[PDB]
C-alpha cells in the first residue's frame, strides 16, 4: 500500500535492533556469504567446466544480481550509517548504473558468440559489489570508532 503506512517509526525499530545486534549482523553476513560462495564452489566443481552457457548461466546471473542488490539494500536499510539526506547522491545512483551495465553485458555476452566469458561479468560484479559493501561498513565503523 502507498500513502498509508509508517516510515519514521519502522525505520527506528529496524535500525535500533540491527544496530544493537551489530555482531549478529556482521556474523550473519560473513556466514551467509561464506556459505553461499563455498556451496557454489563445491557445486560448481562438479561441472568442472562451462558446458552450457544459456539456462544455468541465466538463472545464475539472474539469481546472483537479484540476491546481490536485494541483500545490499536489505542490510543498508536494516542498518544505516549516515546517508546524506533522503535523496540519492551521485555515488548512490552510480552503483545502480554500474550494475546495470555489468549485468546487461554479462547476459549479452552469455548468449553472444564466444561462450565461456559471460560468467566473468558476474564474478567481478559481486566482487566489487560485496567488497564495496563490507569494506564500506568496516572502514566507516573503524574510522568512526575510537580506532
Curated annotation (Swiss-Prot):
Question: Where, in residue ranges, is this chain on the Cytoplasmic side?
Answer: 83-90
Topological domains annotated Extracellular: 43-59, 112-118
State the GO CC annotations.
Answer: apical plasma membrane; membrane; monoatomic ion channel complex; phagocytic vesicle membrane; plasma membrane; secretory granule membrane; specific granule membrane; sperm flagellum
Activity regulation per the record?
A: The channel gating depends on both the membrane potential and the transmembrane pH gradient. The dimers display cooperative channel gating. The channel activity is inhibited by zinc ions and by toxins, and activated by endocannabinoid anandamide and fatty acids.
Membrane topology recorded in Swiss-Prot or TrEMBL: Multi-pass membrane protein
Q: What is the effect of changing residue 126 to A?
A: Faster channel activation and deactivation kinetics
- Modifications the protein undergoes after translation, according to the UniProt entry: Proteolytically cleaved in sperm. The cleaved protomer forms homodimers and heterodimers with the full-length protomer. It confers reduced dependence to intracellular pH changes. Phosphorylated in vitro by PRKCD. Phosphorylation may enhance channel gating.
Do the record's keywords include Secreted? no
Q: Name one GO biological process term.
A: regulation of intracellular pH
**Reaction(s) this enzyme catalyzes, per UniProt:** H(+)(in) = H(+)(out)
Q: What is the effect of changing residue 18 to A?
A: Loss of a phosphorylation site. Strongly reduces phosphorylation
**Top-rank lineage group of the source organism:** Eukaryota
Subunit record text = Homodimer; each protomer forms its own proton conduction pathway.
The record's family statement is: Belongs to the voltage-gated proton channel (VPC) (TC 1.A.51) family.
Domain comment, as recorded: The voltage sensor domain (VSD, segments S1-S4) conducts both gating and ion permeation. The segment S4 is probably the voltage-sensor and is characterized by a series of positively charged amino acids at every third position. Unlike other voltage-gated ion channels it lacks the pore domain. The C-terminal coiled coil region mediates homodimerization and cooperative channel gating. It is essential for normal subcellular localization.
State its role: Voltage-gated proton-selective channel that conducts outward proton currents in response to intracellular acidification. Lacks a canonical ion-channel pore domain and mediates proton permeability via its voltage sensor domain. Appears to play a dominant role in regulation of CO2/HCO3(-)/H(+) equilibrium in sperm flagellum. Prevents the acidification resulting from HCO3(-) synthesis and thus sustains high HCO3(-) levels inside sperm for capacitation.
Question: Which named protein is this?
Answer: Voltage-gated hydrogen channel 1
State the species of origin.
Answer: Homo sapiens (Human)
**Biological classification of the source:** Eukaryota, Metazoa, Chordata, Craniata, Vertebrata
Q: Which residues of the full protein are shown?
A: 83 to 226 of 273
